[PDB]
Every structure is written in C-alpha cells, then in structure tokens.
C-alpha cells in the first residue's frame, strides 16, 4: 500500500469513471492538461442559453459592496485530490464579499437552484486604528477603513482582503480569523486589486 500504489489506485479509479462517462477517453485526458498549454480550449459560448437564464438579485447587509470572490474546488490530476480544505468542505462552493462598511462575509453557493446562504462574517472599525502612526506597525488584526478587494486562495485555506488602509490581512476561510497582517510599506500604497 505504498503511495505509488495509491496514486495507481486513484488513477485506475479515475480512468474507470471516464470509461463509465463514455478516442473519447484519449481526448478528455488531453483536455485535462490543456490548461498547461496556454491557449483557449473552452468553446461553449454558442451552447449557452442566455434567454433561459434564471436571474436572481440576492441583496446583502452592507452599503456599497466593493468586491466579491468565489472559490470553486478543482480535482488535481497529479494527486487526484479535491482542492477542498477539509472533508466537510468537499464540493462546497464559497463566495466572499466586502463593502465599505469594513465587513467581510462568506456565502455558500454550492446549490445553483438555491441561493447564497450566509455562514460567517468579520467586521472592522475604529477599534483597529493603529496607535503608533508609523507604517510598519500597521499590524492590527482588523480593518479600520474601507475595504476594496478580496481574493480566495486556490487551496481553499485562506482569503485575503485589502483596501485604503495600506495593509493586507489573510483570513482563515473556515472561521474568518485573521492569521497574518502584511503592511504595504508605503504612505500611499493602498490596495486596489488582488489576483
């Protein structure tokens, strides 16, 4: 039961699934590595049906929502493991939103028929204003000024937030707990976009 056998087992099960799904198998395996070749390989626009799209406009709590970030687990071909952080999060889709009210909120979007459901949030305020006034001491746990952007780590383990407060905190996805604060080290280096 060595790891190579485990990879062999996971690979063998993976092929069986492809065989169950289905030349075709050869094509799909090539598509599994099409991303490495940096070319467009997803032609599905004509197949999309815009007219029948089920539109919904779910509102949120805070004023002037500034950015949203979605996390989608993806199966890794190299190790045959989902990008989900934990077993509970298997195939769970998460979206994170921030506004100018200094609040980060996560939502669950796994069900397409249903709609995003609030799970947890963290809100900043004047409690987090830095006393030192020297930039490098901008290591406070929470926000104290408008939040502009968010990015979710592809591993599903972290979500990072930034804004006009010249800093970058990374939060734990599960509990939205701040684990690290990265000051920008510029008087006027305010985060505008995260990718």
């Amino acid at each position: 039961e060595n790891p190579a056998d485990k990879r062999r087992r996971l690979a063998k099960q993976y092929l069986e699934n492809l065989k169950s799904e289905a030349d075709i198998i050869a094509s799909r395996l090539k598509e599994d590595v099409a991303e490495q070749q940096g070319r467009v390989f997803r032609y599905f626009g004509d197949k999309l049906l815009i007219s029948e799209a089920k539109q919904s406009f779910t509102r949120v709590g805070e004023n002037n929502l500034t950015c949203i970030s979605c996390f989608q687990p993806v199966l890794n071909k190299y190790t045959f493991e989902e990008s989900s952080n934990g077993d509970k999060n298997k195939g769970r889709l998460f979206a994170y939103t921030v506004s100018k009210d200094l609040q980060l909120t996560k939502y669950d979007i796994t069900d397409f028929s249903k709609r995003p459901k609030k799970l947890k949030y963290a809100k900043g305020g004047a409690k987090y204003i830095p006393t030192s006034k020297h930039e490098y001491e901008n290591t406070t746990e929470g926000h104290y000024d408008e939040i502009l952007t968010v990015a979710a780590s592809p591993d599903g383990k972290y979500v990072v937030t930034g804004g006009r407060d010249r800093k970058l905190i990374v939060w734990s996805t599960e509990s939205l707990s701040p684990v690290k604060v990265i000051p920008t080290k510029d008087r006027r280096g305010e985060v505008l976009s995260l990718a």
Binding site: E135, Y136, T184, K185, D186, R187
Partner: peptide, 11 residues
C-alpha cells in the same frame, strides 16, 4: 526609497 525611514522603513 523603500529602505528610507521616510519611505516606510524602521526609524
């Protein structure tokens, strides 16, 4: 400069 005390470094 980044290393400068006026550019964001330590005092």
């Amino acid at each position: 400069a980044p290393t400068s005390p006026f550019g964001g470094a330590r005092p």
